């Protein structure tokens, strides 16, 4: 069976490398830009929900979040319903930088799709949505500590 | 504004790495290290600079992973008669014996990723992703050298 997993991994790493270089002077490198984007779009989100959105590990997310906090791009607010799980908000500075991250992503997205007809783009997006769903279930299964048969 | 494929690619990639890290946790192949051992097994004697270009990762990250694989006896650095400053990367015997497990686990997740797809639907996707990889590869190179994109 044909493999997509290696190409997906390379594309994703290449995109993050490029973003990290382009945000290097703005305290948004080392992959931090991904967190700020989701936090701007989901103001007040708790960290465990963010982690589930991103499908990343807790320790990696924690490192990135505290660094964004240190650099004044996000702030943690009191959660009256659960003291342990603080609410994540962007700061004013974080919101002012958000459109730059989106623009940079849009530019890379246009580069990635160079030479595609509109017809090719639409099946690629729906197929990726399908791929995402197939693996999300196994991600959740395995994250809960259950073991796969492989 | 055309439709975005980048967010989904990123989430798919992170989800796959997370599953792999969990399934290799007891074998010193987590923290993304499995990615390196695979390419070193498949390209014996490769230098780190070339491995970085295959993976499209940064030097610091790759350096850390390779050092940890060397610490855990999965790869070994050999002297390079052509440039002593860049050592040759080989798998150890142990690294080689674990290689097929990484492939099997990756193959399984690939099969899951492609579930529910018609055969025809799989062929279109493979070619499209190759096209995307090539497009992005050029920009990565351009930017890694210090050149500035116009965005």
| DSSP codes of every residue in A6-39 | HHHHHHHHHHHHHHHHHTGGGT-TTTHHHHHHHH
Structural domains in chain A, CATH included, are 2-132 (1.10.10.10)
Q: What are phi and psi of A75, to 5 degrees?
A: -140, 145
Resolution at which this structure was determined, Å: 1.9
> Mind spelling out the 3-state secondary structure of A35-53?
HHHHHHHCCCEEHHHHHHH
The reply to whether residue B129 touches residue A13, judged by beta carbons under 8 angstroms, is: no
Secondary structure class of B86 (helix, strand, coil): coil
> DSSP state, B74?
S
The reply to whether residue A7 touches residue B110, judged by beta carbons under 8 angstroms, is: no
Pairing relation of β-strands B46-47 and B88-91?
A: antiparallel
Q: Name residue, tokens 């007040």.
A: A44
The reply to whether residue B136 touches residue A14, judged by beta carbons under 8 angstroms, is: yes
> Do A97 and A71 contact (CB within 8 A), yes or no?
no
Q: What are phi and psi of A76, to 5 degrees?
A: -95, 130
> Do B64 and B48 contact (CB within 8 A), yes or no?
no
Closest Cα in chain A to B115: A134
Instruction: Please list, residue by residue across B70-94, b when 16 or more beta carbons sit within 10 angstroms of its beta carbon and e when fewer do.
Output: eebebbbeeeeeeeeeebbbbbbee
What Å distances lie between residue A78 and A51, A75, B52, CA to CA?
Answer: 19, 10, 42
Specify the experimental method: X-ray
Question: Which of B 91-150 lie inside 8 A of A, CB atoms?
Answer: 104-117, 121-126, 128-133, 135-137, 139-140, 143-144, 149
Q: Could you say which of A12, A21, A121 has the minimum Cβ distance to residue B3?
A: A121
Q: Give the integer Cα–Cα distance in Å for B125 and B106.
A: 18
Chain B hits for A123, Cβ within 8 Å: 124, 128
């Amino acid at each position: 069976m044909k493999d997509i997993l290696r190409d997906i991994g390379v594309i994703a790493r290449a995109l993050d490398s490029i973003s990290n270089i382009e945000f290097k002077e703005l305290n948004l490198a080392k992959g931090q830009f991904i967190y700020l984007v989701r936090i701007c779009e989901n103001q007040g989100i708790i960290q465990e929900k963010l982690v589930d959105i991103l499908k990343i590990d807790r320790t990696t997310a924690s490192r990135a979040i505290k660094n964004l906090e240190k650099n004044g791009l996000i702030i943690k607010k009191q959660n009256k319903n659960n003291k342990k799980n603080k609410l994540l908000f962007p700061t004013e500075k974080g919101q002012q930088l958000y459109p730059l991250i989106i623009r940079e992503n849009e530019y890379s997205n246009a580069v990635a799709l160079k030479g595609f007809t509109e017809a090719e783009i639409n099946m690629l997006t729906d197929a990726l949505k399908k791929v995402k769903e197939n693996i999300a279930d196994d991600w959740l299964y395995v994250k809960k500590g259950n073991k796969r048969s492989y």
